[PDB]
């Protein structure tokens, strides 16, 4: 029972994460790179500071990590290996976190209501701020789901402890790279 609830939550929330990053890219970012509208000079050609490497994190989850997690759906005791297999990809959350204060300040000081208007226009419940925190939330949530799997999988579950070790190492290294 419990390992199945956990795996289902891991997958459902991964899909919701991919959906969230997609929505972020195809609205807030697309309005900047599009040339549909005009962009405050304060943020012109600064989409790389606002969005950091969120495109590359999205490509990872959308192209690879959701598809590979899904293949572990009936193997929750083994899913820790998915995080070991793809550990180097998670380094791009270190990049993202480092850039996040610079993103927030530039939005604050220079974007005015440019993103609030896009939000109203598309009828999104989530602000650009709400979307851009999601990689920071997600990267610190995997370790919680792996810890829950350890509470209810056999000692045939070092195909969890190694995974959790990776997913504690990544947020700590992101934390340690902040200024």
């Amino acid at each position: 029972r419990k390992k199945e609830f956990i795996m289902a939550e891991l997958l459902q929330t991964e899909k919701a994460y991919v959906r969230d990053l997609h929505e972020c890219l195809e609205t807030y970012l697309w309005e900047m790179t599009s040339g549909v509208e005009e962009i405050p000079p304060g943020i012109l050609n600064k989409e790389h500071i606002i969005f950091g490497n969120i495109q590359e994190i999205y490509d990872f989850h959308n192209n690879i990590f959701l598809k590979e997690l899904e293949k572990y759906e009936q193997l929750p005791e083994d899913v820790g290996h998915c995080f070991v297999t793809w550990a180097d990809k998670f380094q791009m959350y270190v990049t993202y976190c480092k850039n996040k204060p610079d993103s927030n300040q530039l939005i604050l000081e220079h974007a005015g209501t440019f993103f609030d208007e896009i939000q109203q226009r598309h009828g999104l419940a989530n602000s650009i701020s709400s979307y851009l925190i999601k990689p920071v939330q997600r990267v610190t949530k995997y370790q919680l789901l792996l810890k829950e799997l350890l509470t209810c999988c056999e000692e045939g579950k070092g195909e969890l402890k190694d995974g959790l070790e990776v997913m504690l190492s990544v947020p700590k290294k992101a934390n340690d790279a902040m200024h």
Binding site: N104, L108, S129, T140, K141, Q143, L144, L145, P171, N175
Partner: protein, 177 residues
Amino acid sequence: MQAIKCVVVGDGAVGKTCLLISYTTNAFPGEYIPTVFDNYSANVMVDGKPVNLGLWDTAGQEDYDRLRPLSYPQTDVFLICFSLVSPASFENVRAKWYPEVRHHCPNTPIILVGTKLDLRDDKDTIEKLKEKKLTPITYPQGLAMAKEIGAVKYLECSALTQRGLKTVFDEAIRAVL
């Protein structure tokens, strides 16, 4: 229509994720407590005035001192939470939560929230604290902590029974209006 960003902080032991699921779904999640509560918004009316309440969780961030503050900018109100049956979590209000919230958000209102009210009277819980020479946190302890951190209210609640749960979030909204 006024939009309110409310960020929930405190130790793992508070049950922050369970608090937000129980509030937003109007039911204790019972069978399975989800680990993920994604950024949430709903229209909720307080004193006749409709308001858009945004709720962010911070579960998973408890060990990442430099990551947690990324969530703090532009917060309208904080819930600083402790478990009424975790004296360690209560002391962490003073030692950990208040300092960083005040450093980053010096003018932002704080509601002090004691969670797990349902367990303050629990024989097994009380006995486990007694074996460590501890007791649950009582109402005047919360009042004294609230006063010290400048909290605008001290509120006690249970996600299990829903006792005081709606009041927490009503008073978070009132702290901003």
